[PDB]
Design a binder for this molecule. Structure first.
Ligand SMILES: [Ca+2]
Ligand SMILES: [Ca+2]
Lengths: 533, 533
């Protein structure tokens, strides 16, 4: 719905200052601290402060361990979702390993875990990687480690023929039944901010409710999981029968039977026993608790954060990760600034994938929380802006003022109080009596106090100097500030407003300069104070 | 030996310039691009250029893999020595493992390597670390990995009783003799820039001379080694005897003997064979080729490199490693500068240990080669200066001019052509007619062309303004440049020379300023051109 905004007047210039005590910026390069009138789409601005993000070259060594920030792990730095899972697949090979390991035949034996490929790919949001350097089963490298092998029921042992000199049946490990029934373990999903737990048998009323089994190490991207019921079958043998017989006169020994086993004490042949080793098929089941190490690639970032304060220009720079050489500028980047070195930024090196929500103060990184831009956004600036607004509460409020037949701006940017789209958020505020300005003028606005001060209302005729726009955030009305005097150079020539910012009731202007030949010169900086109510 | 240097005259000031177009530096802080007259000990200066090195906080995750730079591995970044070694110790446990692995009983079996602790400590120059995350033998983590197990002689197999239905003796693995002779392997020293090789049997005249066995991965700090002759003993059994016998009339079978084994074909009891399984003790020897992963802690570094050029002041900053927050300034640091952003630096975060030789150009790290300061230097500035000169060809030539009864300087700094100590390198050059200057004046000199221009000859009397010293590098003579006019402020007051640099026949001066109360003000910068011959 449209809403008319009447021009209530013109704010006269109360003071002008040449800003000379500052570093030289080439008009062909741009201001190092003053955002250009074409950068409204990169800011939710609050003052003469400018940021730029560079992406360092990287490789598979620039890793971000999966360390999710949650209620239970507030010190983690990941905000994106990742839910890996898999199973221990049972077959002659893996059963062999589990078997030899639980019976103590060989403690280096361990079955190989089978991750679900798609849960690792994670819909490419972001694409995760398994750290195969984490653990190895012999010559095989794996990102998984069996921590605990727990048989569900006490392990069976096979009986053996009674001892000749003791008649006491011995013992030996059951033999795996190669053609028996194999059972894959259940679903093992890794968790990172809390241990794997099982319900306390006698929970009510004895605490604790659950019992911790194993712990993940989120700082290292190590997750924990439980693979219940890995099963295979074995052949167990049990002793049997009795004894007795009657062998006499010139001897004392008898004979008969088939398939049976007769043993007679070596110290006393009269003391005897018999029986058989009956083979039974048994189910071996074991719960296996494991850990998994994951990560995603994270290109190092370098951010400059410069602003004007105390009449000077403070330059800052920060790096995140092992920065080496620059690969390019960040694909996407929006900055909310306070005008004094404070800034919340959302930086995405690419059009999708790993992104960083950064909190800055001068050259200090107060915090970094990582997000991931879904591939579905198709690298669309407009699409990402909405996604960031929804997931981080950030939106480029400084971009929005536009001049078609008249100046107009959406409620959202004008009010600059709610980053998310919503009812009435796209209502259009049209400024009346603003038709003379040209269509090609660009605006970067600063929502402060009662006004949305947008810089850069230009004219098709050189004779008319640029004007700054002050719009009441309640839509009640707007004012213009003619800064012709402040911008006047030659008798008939004027400096244009190419860089603009507004803070504490003060306007900061940057003007591009060139030689008669067209060679870049230092940007002219000025400070203009409007006579506000 | 002393050498007299006569004062040949006074170089008049040909021009003076107020350097105003530069950033504000607090007199309580120091110049950001102009070295102070007290920093001669940190430079082999070449112009108005200043550097500072900060050490980031770090932990065991900030690693420097051992990647030595040598003729065969020119892309490595380590220059310090490290020679780890160890052996595979033979005993029932390790023999068991090697045995089960070479005979294919269990392929996850691997003996544990025994490093020589002191070779790892490396005399703390620097202290090296083993990467136990590199490989594991079951639940045990280790920095070593057996790559190849090579038996010296073909593995023996034990015979077994002939097959009842075939009469053909079978086979089975020999049994380890628990109380047999165990032999530790030979010395295994890891190498990083070339493979482990063995001489080519038929070398002359058939190439190649040596044969590559395994390769190290220096970029990952992975070294390679050969552990020859790991030995243990086994009990091997061999078949024996013959057959024949004569059992008749109502039968066809005989009996006798003791400890012997008689087998009669199941399909033909008449076809028979006999013998015994004779046990012999055999020596099993195996060469084992392995890799080892090492590294040393490397605190990230951040370096500012600022200088004046094209009448402006260029500020640069570089980081090496994953810099986070600052822990402190580098303990030791010397910089050789060209005056235009180019610099070779030797930075040591601590008083001993890992150090970096860095090549810079503005904000670009051209190269980094790591060295190690021996603990024996006792963190002594003077001791390290000599060590760096000897191992890197770097010495703080800008520090050396001193005024006792007269100005004097050692040949080494004066000539500024050879960083190493040596004959005549400490000959003292004493400037005649320089006795009026005060003892507490400080000097930072710049060896350029024919002169060693040292800034800061001060007087005990405020009435006399500071003077700049020009000494002929051949010791032929010296000149002074009275810059009283250029430094004059009040009628009876003068600015002092607190920061100084000299380049292209131009003198750069920095002067500390304060309020009548004693509050710091911006440093006053000037450019003075002396009327040279
Ligand atoms: Ca337009
Ligand atoms: Ca002195």
């Amino acid at each position: 719905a449209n809403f008319n905004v009447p021009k209530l007047g013109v704010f006269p210039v109360a003071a002008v200052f040449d800003i000379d005590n500052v570093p030289e910026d080439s008009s062909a390069t741009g201001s190092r601290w003053l955002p250009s009138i074409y950068q409204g789409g990169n800011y939710w601005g609050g003052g003469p402060q400018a940021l730029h993000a560079q992406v360092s070259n990287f490789d598979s060594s620039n890793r971000l361990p999966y360390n999710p920030r949650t209620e239970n792990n507030p010190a983690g730095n990941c905000a994106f979702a990742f839910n890996p899972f898999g199973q221990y697949i049972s077959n002659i090979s893996s059963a062999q390993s589990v078997h030899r390991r639980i019976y103590g035949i060989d403690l280096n034996d361990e079955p190989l875990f089978s991750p679900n490929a798609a849960s690792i790919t994670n819909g490419g949001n972001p694409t995760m990687s398994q750290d195969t350097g984490y653990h190895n089963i012999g010559p095989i490298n794996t990102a998984y480690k069996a921590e605990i092998f727990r048989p569900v029921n006490p392990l069976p042992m096979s009986d053996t023929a009674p001892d000749p000199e003791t008649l006491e049946p011995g013992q030996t490990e059951p033999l795996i039944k190669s053609d028996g029934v194999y059972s894959n373990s259940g679903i093992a999903s890794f968790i990172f901010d809390r241990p794997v737990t099982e319900p306390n048998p006698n929970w009510p009323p004895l605490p604790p409710p659950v019992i911790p089994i194993i712990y993940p190490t989120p700082a290292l991207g190590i997750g924990a999981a439980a693979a219940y019921g890995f099963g295979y079958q074995v052949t167990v043998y049990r002793w049997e029968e009795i004894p007795v017989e009657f062998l006499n006169p010139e001897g004392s020994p008898c004979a008969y039977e088939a398939g049976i086993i007769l043993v007679r004490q070596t110290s006393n042949p009269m003391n005897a026993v018999a029986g058989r080793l009956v083979p039974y098929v048994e189910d071996i089941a074991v719960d296996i608790f494991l850990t998994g190490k994951f990560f995603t690639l994270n290109p190092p970032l370098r951010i400059t954060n410069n602003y004007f304060a105390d009449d000077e220009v403070k330059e800052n720079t920060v790096t995140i990760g092992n920065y080496t050489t620059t690969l390019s500028s960040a694909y996407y980047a929006v900055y909310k600034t306070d005008g004094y070195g404070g800034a919340t930024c959302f930086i995405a090196s690419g059009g999708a994938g790993i992104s960083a929500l950064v909190q800055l103060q001068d050259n200090s990184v107060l915090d970094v929380l990582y997000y991931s831009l879904p591939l579905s956004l198709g690298g669309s600036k407009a699409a990402i802006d909405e996604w960031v607004a929804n997931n981080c509460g950030l939106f480029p409020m400084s971009g929005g003022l536009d001049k078609t037949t008249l100046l107009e701006i959406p409620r959202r940017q004008l009010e600059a109080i709610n980053p998310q789209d919503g009812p009435g958020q796209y209502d259009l505020f049209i400024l009346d009596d603003s038709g003379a300005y040209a269509s090609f003028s660009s605006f970067i606005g600063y929502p402060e106090a009662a006004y949305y001060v947008a810089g850069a209302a230009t004219f098709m005729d050189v004779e008319n100097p640029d004007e700054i726009i002050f719009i009441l955030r309640n839509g009640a009305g707007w004012y213009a500030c003619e800064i012709g005097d402040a911008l006047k150079i030659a008798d008939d020539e004027f400096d244009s407003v190419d860089y603009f910012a507004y803070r504490g009731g003060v306007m900061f202007i940057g003007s591009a300069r060139y030689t008669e030949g067209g060679d870049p010169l230092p940007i002219k900086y000025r400070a203009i104070i409007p006579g506000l109510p």
